[PDB]
Amino acid sequence: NKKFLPFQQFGRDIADTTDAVRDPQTLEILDITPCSFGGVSVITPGTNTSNQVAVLYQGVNCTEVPVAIHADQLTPTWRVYSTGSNVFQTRAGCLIGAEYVNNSYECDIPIGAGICASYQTQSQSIIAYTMSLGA
Amino acid sequence: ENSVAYSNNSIAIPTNFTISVTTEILPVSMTKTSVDCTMYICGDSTECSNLLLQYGSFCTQLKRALTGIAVEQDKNTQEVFAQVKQIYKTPPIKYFGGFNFSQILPDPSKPSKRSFIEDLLFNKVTLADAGFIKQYGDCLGDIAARDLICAQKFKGLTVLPPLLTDEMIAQYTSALLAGTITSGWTFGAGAALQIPFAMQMAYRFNGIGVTQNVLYENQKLIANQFNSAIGKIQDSLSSTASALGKLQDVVNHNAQALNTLVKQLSSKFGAISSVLNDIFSRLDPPEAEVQIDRLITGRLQSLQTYVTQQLIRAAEIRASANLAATKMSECVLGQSKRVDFCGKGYHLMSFPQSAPHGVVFLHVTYVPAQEKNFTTAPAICHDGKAHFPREGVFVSNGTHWFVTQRNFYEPQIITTDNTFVSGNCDVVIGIVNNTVYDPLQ
Amino acid sequence: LICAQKFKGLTVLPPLLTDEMIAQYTSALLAGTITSGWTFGAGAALQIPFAMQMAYRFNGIGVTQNVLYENQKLIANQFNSAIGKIQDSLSSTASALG
Amino acid sequence: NLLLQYGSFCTQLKRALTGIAVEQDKNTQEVFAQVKQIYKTPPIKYFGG
Amino acid sequence: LITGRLQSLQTYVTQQLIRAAEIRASANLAATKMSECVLGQSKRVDFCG
Ligand SMILES: *[C@@H]1O[C@H](CO)[C@@H](O[C@@H]2O[C@H](CO)[C@@H](O)[C@H](O)[C@H]2NC(C)=O)[C@H](O)[C@H]1NC(C)=O
Ligand SMILES: *[C@@H]1O[C@H](CO)[C@@H](O[C@@H]2O[C@H](CO)[C@@H](O)[C@H](O)[C@H]2NC(C)=O)[C@H](O)[C@H]1NC(C)=O
Ligand SMILES: *[C@@H]1O[C@H](CO)[C@@H](O[C@@H]2O[C@H](CO)[C@@H](O)[C@H](O)[C@H]2NC(C)=O)[C@H](O)[C@H]1NC(C)=O
Ligand SMILES: *[C@@H]1O[C@H](CO)[C@@H](O[C@@H]2O[C@H](CO)[C@@H](O)[C@H](O)[C@H]2NC(C)=O)[C@H](O)[C@H]1NC(C)=O
Ligand SMILES: *[C@@H]1O[C@H](CO)[C@@H](O)[C@H](O)[C@H]1NC(C)=O
Ligand SMILES: *[C@@H]1O[C@H](CO)[C@@H](O)[C@H](O)[C@H]1NC(C)=O
Ligand SMILES: *[C@@H]1O[C@H](CO)[C@@H](O)[C@H](O)[C@H]1NC(C)=O
Ligand SMILES: *[C@@H]1O[C@H](CO)[C@@H](O)[C@H](O)[C@H]1NC(C)=O
């Protein structure tokens, strides 16, 4: 929506980054954003115990991670997590492959925003919950 | 300047005293950060991947070092705050010998249980503007000027959220304050054991060389002085907008480092330009490889310098955090005898409060005043036997002699159960004659 | 050699506090501790005879006041001998600073 | 002119270097200056031998 | 030549910044010792003599 001046052609932001450009034909200033990307983290309970892992995409809402894996061309072993089998959106991006219980416990494997993940035998799996300070 | 009327038989003794509230601030953690390698180095080009992988896995060292810094940060914060294994709740009754506590106690009537003073600090800083990706990735359509944090994120420089959120930190501070208000310092050793506040204050005065009888007889004055001090510190902190300094210094330092790094991207490095696609397409591979090599080397060197500087600042923050933890463990959970270590003057107690990137201690102390002149002597010889005080000193307004304490004028008569004897009275240098009392005669 | 370093841009700035006023602070602190014991650390200065302060400090380390009033001369003599010895030792070895 | 390509690099160096310059003064001021007044001994001096 | 000299200056600045923190720690220790063992009597053994 931000307006230009009749002579003004394209916008720039601090640290010489291009943000918005006026189209030559319609003379309307459209906004340009860098393509989606991020970092991946692997939540693991230990090789000796189990082989079930959770994945964490940092700093992004993951309504678009299945397409991210489709374009990045990772194996269907990654596409299974790209599909929303078990998706939870925390403050630190989102985690895929972990059920979110509604009770509280202590913390063993940190993630962020005061949310932890741990392996529990009920139906052994990788649960994810909210930190509890103590009794 | 201030001269002193020194002598060899004169002594001054304070008559009155005051309670003052002192404030101090300590940083405990910087902002954690991460870094992307390939998108920073040249910005999404395949030839980059083809040409830089043989330069070495330097970004592996970068990632591991910066991850070590990140984990050290939340290690510091959890070591400095998480020192109580329970959570303590104040009772609905809030009468403590007339000691008002509305300002610092947590407020149920507020979103998030953040007390008044810490709310005041949080609104005084108002320069972090969160920035810990409070569900970021919403700056896709930048109708506004895009700010600065999103742009810094879009150059491969991310920031991770801290492990501990603010409200749980506030809960920890509330637990500490409740424990130190309701059960003395016993909860520092084991399970909390309740003691009424007045006798806890009596204990603390008994710690600093003064007997309980001074407190139980002047409770109302103590309450009034305490409340007035709390109001005064409220007003003083609300007034000045530049009393913090250190936290702003840390934030500005980190911002300057990031800004220098992002500005360094537009260096020519003795080459044609800072553009990648033009240099690759216009030139031919034999010279394009030379130019790309020079750019990569320059940018790697700059990134290495930034990493080293961040590593350096981490150690200073670590030292400050360790000292803060020691002070929190000693001044709060006990009563330190180290002068000028938990506030000026004799120390009574301290309360902690949270702050967006650190802690703030309120020290409640003791300060004598209204001194008076008197004449003294080391001992009194009676019936050829010297006599020395039990714990006080001998004083006299000119006519009669008395034993008194060392920080509050309170005369008493020279009785045989308030002194002791050693040898004859021909050896000491300042003997003065008087009488003594035996109560049973 | 300082001039040569200067003509390469390696300017050395002078410290804000000159030595004389540093000595003035040290003398003020020494006067405070000699004439007022410790009370001037917390509040204002309070005069008190020196023997009283030494008796207090002995009372601190597990010894009653009745050791000082009949050992004053020995205390003074040993103190003076020790301070003369420290003067001589400091004047002798120039490598103890390190 | 060629350093202008590197631009404010030594400006950054100066900004970094001034910090320790002020820090030294802060250190000395903190370590010594901790007295509100400037006392002085009485002219007559006999401190019990 | 420019790059080499700039690199040398940078490493010198880094080394000086390194020494500054050590001097800061020593100054903190000295301030603590003067505040404790001069303005009062310390119960800690071997902290002061
Ligand atoms: C010690 O000082 C306090 C205040 O500095 C004195 O209390 C004040 O006394 C005056 C005299 O009547 C009153 O007008 C004030 O209202 C008192 N203040 C408070 C807070 O109650 C106190 O009297 C002094 N102690 C002695 C023994 O004189
Ligand atoms: C502790 O001090 C606070 C200071 O605000 C007192 O709060 C005041 O309470 C009165 C009671 O009617 C109100 O009229 C005021 O408006 C309150 N102050 C403010 C700024 O709103 C509190 O009452 C004191 N504690 C006790 C037990 O009296
Ligand atoms: C020194 O203080 C003592 C104690 O307060 C004074 O002695 C008493 O003074 C009152 C008031 O004049 C008399 O009613 C008492 O009879 C006195 N008691 C005794 C045992 O004499 C004394 O007057 C004060 N002296 C000076 C010079 O101030
Ligand atoms: C304290 O009282 C005693 C007792 O009178 C004084 O001792 C006298 O000292 C003189 C000095 O030679 C002798 O001549 C007297 O014989 C002593 N008295 C007795 C009863 O033998 C002593 O001087 C007094 N001290 C002070 C400081 O007044
Ligand atoms: C991602 O989550 C945020 C926060 O809940 C929301 O505002 C946004 O609309 C989500 N993304 C999409 C594509 O819906
Ligand atoms: C979890 O518990 C909260 C209680 O505040 C409730 O609001 C929420 O619906 C619960 N969610 C599930 C999935 O049980
Ligand atoms: C105090 O010192 C002065 C000066 O030396 C001396 O004249 C006086 O006798 C001393 N006081 C006593 C009680 O000896
Ligand atoms: C004690 O006496 C001296 C000398 O007469 C005087 O200078 C000093 O002010 C007196 N003390 C007080 C507290 O007034």
Side-chain angles (χ1 to χ4, degrees):
Chain A
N1 75 343
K2 186 70 175 177
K3 62 92 176 178
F4 273 20
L5 298 199
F7 73 104
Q8 190 59 265
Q9 281 314 299
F10 68 98
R12 194 164 280 258
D13 202 325
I14 297 169
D16 66 3
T17 61
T18 301
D19 283 16
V21 182
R22 151 187 301 158
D23 46 9
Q25 299 277 350
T26 311
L27 306 187
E28 162 59 23
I29 294 91
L30 293 180
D31 194 359
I32 297 89
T33 308
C35 61
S36 50
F37 80 105
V40 295
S41 277
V42 172
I43 304 301
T44 316
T47 183
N48 70 340
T49 302
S50 162
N51 285 359
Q52 279 60 23
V53 302
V55 76
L56 156 71
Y57 300 116
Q58 269 172 331
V60 59
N61 181 346
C62 58
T63 72
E64 64 276 19
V65 288
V67 181
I69 303 308
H70 290 125
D72 217 350
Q73 191 60 255
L74 258 181
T75 61
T77 81
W78 300 81
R79 299 270 179 82
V80 62
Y81 308 118
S82 73
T83 59
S85 83
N86 298 305
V87 173
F88 182 33
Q89 179 85 42
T90 64
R91 179 77 34 86
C94 65
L95 76 165
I96 284 174
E99 182 193 8
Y100 172 78
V101 73
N102 214 349
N103 59 188
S104 311
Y105 297 111
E106 52 90 11
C107 188
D108 61 337
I109 312 304
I111 297 89
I115 281 173
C116 312
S118 181
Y119 187 82
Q120 62 92 13
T121 78
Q122 191 183 10
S123 303
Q124 291 71 256
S125 167
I126 291 287
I127 204 72
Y129 57 90
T130 296
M131 201 145 48
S132 75
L133 318 176
Chain B
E1 74 88 18
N2 187 34
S3 158
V4 286
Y6 173 86
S7 171
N8 44 11
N9 57 352
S10 178
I11 175 174
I13 284 175
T15 306
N16 211 351
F17 67 110
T18 52
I19 318 300
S20 66
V21 165
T22 314
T23 315
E24 61 185 359
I25 309 102
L26 298 167
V28 308
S29 71
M30 51 175 38
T31 70
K32 331 163 62 179
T33 174
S34 165
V35 56
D36 187 0
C37 183
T38 174
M39 198 203 273
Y40 171 62
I41 188 50
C42 83
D44 191 76
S45 87
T46 77
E47 58 270 17
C48 295
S49 60
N50 305 118
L51 194 145
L52 64 86
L53 64 85
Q54 53 277 42
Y55 278 161
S57 57
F58 279 63
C59 285
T60 296
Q61 286 78 16
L62 266 65
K63 283 164 182 74
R64 68 172 62 176
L66 201 59
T67 300
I69 282 182
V71 67
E72 184 157 83
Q73 287 307 284
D74 66 359
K75 168 60 60 155
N76 271 353
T77 192
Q78 208 195 15
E79 173 175 89
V80 65
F81 273 111
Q83 273 202 0
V84 171
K85 304 310 211 287
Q86 297 83 354
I87 304 295
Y88 299 82
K89 300 289 94 176
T90 184
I93 177 62
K94 287 167 208 40
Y95 170 75
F96 306 103
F99 284 67
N100 195 348
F101 272 109
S102 67
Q103 303 316 108
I104 55 183
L105 276 180
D107 174 24
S109 81
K110 165 161 288 189
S112 82
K113 305 296 99 176
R114 206 181 301 115
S115 85
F116 194 97
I117 288 296
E118 43 199 4
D119 277 329
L120 184 60
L121 279 73
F122 191 81
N123 288 355
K124 287 292 287 186
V125 166
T126 45
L127 281 193
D129 200 5
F132 302 102
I133 48 178
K134 60 98 175 180
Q135 188 274 330
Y136 278 16
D138 286 23
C139 54
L140 274 296
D142 311 322
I143 49 160
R146 205 196 190 108
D147 199 14
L148 190 61
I149 309 305
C150 278
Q152 288 153 312
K153 184 212 318 178
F154 300 158
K155 310 307 286 303
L157 293 192
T158 72
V159 56
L160 316 176
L163 192 156
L164 285 200
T165 67
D166 53 59
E167 60 276 47
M168 51 185 38
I169 285 307
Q171 271 169 241
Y172 278 162
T173 62
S174 170
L176 282 174
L177 191 150
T180 195
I181 193 178
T182 198
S183 58
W185 64 77
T186 64
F187 89 99
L193 318 173
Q194 62 271 46
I195 301 282
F197 200 72
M199 320 173 291
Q200 164 167 357
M201 294 299 291
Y203 275 14
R204 304 264 192 133
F205 282 171
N206 206 347
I208 183 63
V210 185
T211 309
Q212 302 106 327
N213 53 348
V214 73
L215 170 73
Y216 279 130
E217 298 166 15
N218 321 303
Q219 206 171 351
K220 294 181 186 299
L221 182 141
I222 309 307
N224 280 318
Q225 296 215 16
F226 192 101
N227 300 343
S228 170
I230 293 298
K232 197 185 71 193
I233 185 50
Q234 183 166 4
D235 169 38
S236 178
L237 182 60
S238 45
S239 84
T240 294
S242 166
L244 296 94
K246 282 82 62 185
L247 305 174
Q248 278 321 311
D249 178 29
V250 173
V251 176
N252 292 11
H253 280 193
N254 189 179
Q256 273 320 113
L258 289 194
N259 197 278
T260 297
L261 194 141
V262 70
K263 264 301 185 73
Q264 199 47 256
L265 183 63
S266 306
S267 165
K268 310 293 102 174
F269 286 110
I272 309 103
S273 179
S274 297
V275 58
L276 175 66
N277 304 323
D278 291 331
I279 292 319
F280 194 21
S281 71
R282 167 253 174 281
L283 294 166
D284 191 72
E287 76 268 19
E289 71 91 17
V290 179
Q291 294 311 297
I292 298 303
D293 167 64
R294 299 199 292 137
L295 272 295
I296 301 299
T297 54
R299 267 161 185 172
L300 267 291
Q301 188 274 331
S302 163
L303 193 42
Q304 192 82 39
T305 298
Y306 163 81
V307 163
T308 297
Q309 188 277 332
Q310 271 301 287
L311 210 64
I312 301 299
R313 272 219 286 259
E316 189 75 329
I317 295 301
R318 181 80 162 94
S320 185
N322 278 348
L323 187 139
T326 286
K327 267 165 78 84
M328 182 285 318
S329 175
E330 287 205 358
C331 318
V332 177
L333 263 59
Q335 184 219 41
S336 179
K337 297 296 289 183
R338 303 170 50 179
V339 289
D340 291 331
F341 186 71
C342 316
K344 293 210 171 204
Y346 316 129
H347 167 236
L348 289 193
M349 64 183 73
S350 44
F351 312 135
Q353 292 285 354
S354 161
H357 275 298
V359 72
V360 169
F361 287 108
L362 314 187
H363 292 327
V364 172
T365 65
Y366 178 87
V367 161
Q370 285 209 26
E371 64 273 20
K372 285 200 69 60
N373 279 0
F374 305 97
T375 77
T376 187
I380 296 89
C381 164
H382 179 78
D383 301 356
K385 299 184 187 295
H387 286 84
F388 299 167
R390 190 138 295 284
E391 198 73 6
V393 287
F394 293 115
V395 286
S396 44
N397 52 349
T399 294
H400 322 97
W401 288 98
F402 296 89
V403 176
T404 183
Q405 317 163 9
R406 302 171 190 202
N407 309 75
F408 208 73
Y409 191 16
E410 201 72 12
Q412 287 85 51
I413 318 172
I414 313 298
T415 72
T416 189
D417 52 356
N418 201 356
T419 175
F420 59 90
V421 55
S422 160
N424 63 7
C425 65
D426 47 36
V427 73
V428 176
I429 62 166
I431 301 299
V432 169
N433 279 326
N434 193 353
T435 177
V436 298
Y437 270 48
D438 168 34
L440 61 83
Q441 282 308 110
Chain C
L1 79 168
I2 311 301
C3 299
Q5 291 138 358
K6 168 199 299 197
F7 293 103
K8 298 307 158 282
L10 277 296
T11 64
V12 64
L13 302 185
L16 184 140
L17 285 191
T18 79
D19 200 279
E20 180 269 358
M21 51 185 108
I22 298 314
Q24 189 162 354
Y25 291 168
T26 59
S27 160
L29 270 172
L30 191 153
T33 187
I34 184 182
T35 198
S36 56
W38 47 62
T39 64
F40 89 101
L46 308 173
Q47 67 280 54
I48 190 167
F50 196 69
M52 301 265 158
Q53 170 194 163
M54 211 65 98
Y56 274 19
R57 282 171 189 262
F58 283 170
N59 203 358
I61 300 318
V63 182
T64 49
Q65 325 177 9
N66 47 2
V67 70
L68 180 74
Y69 294 132
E70 48 271 56
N71 294 310
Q72 210 151 3
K73 298 163 174 52
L74 274 299
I75 289 289
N77 298 0
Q78 299 162 226
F79 187 106
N80 298 316
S81 301
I83 195 165
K85 178 259 291 182
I86 192 175
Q87 157 162 355
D88 264 347
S89 168
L90 191 43
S91 183
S92 58
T93 289
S95 307
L97 281 73
Chain D
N1 313 133
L2 268 49
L3 191 143
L4 294 175
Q5 314 323 297
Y6 310 81
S8 64
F9 182 76
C10 73
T11 313
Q12 171 267 348
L13 292 188
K14 188 54 71 195
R15 270 174 269 111
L17 196 41
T18 312
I20 62 170
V22 72
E23 167 168 25
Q24 296 320 289
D25 206 0
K26 188 169 50 94
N27 284 358
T28 298
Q29 204 279 344
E30 174 174 359
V31 65
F32 284 107
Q34 277 183 348
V35 286
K36 279 74 65 179
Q37 313 87 326
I38 314 297
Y39 314 89
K40 69 177 64 83
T41 46
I44 187 65
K45 296 183 289 294
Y46 165 64
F47 305 100
Chain E
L1 183 63
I2 289 297
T3 53
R5 274 167 176 189
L6 270 293
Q7 184 273 333
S8 162
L9 187 49
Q10 180 47 75
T11 196
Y12 157 78
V13 174
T14 300
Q15 196 276 157
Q16 275 294 109
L17 204 48
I18 301 320
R19 190 92 56 72
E22 204 279 344
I23 294 301
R24 186 57 151 83
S26 177
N28 270 331
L29 163 69
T32 296
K33 194 172 299 223
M34 183 279 288
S35 161
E36 188 150 317
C37 287
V38 184
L39 278 298
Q41 167 172 334
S42 163
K43 308 291 190 60
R44 331 160 72 180
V45 178
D46 268 11
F47 180 50
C48 292

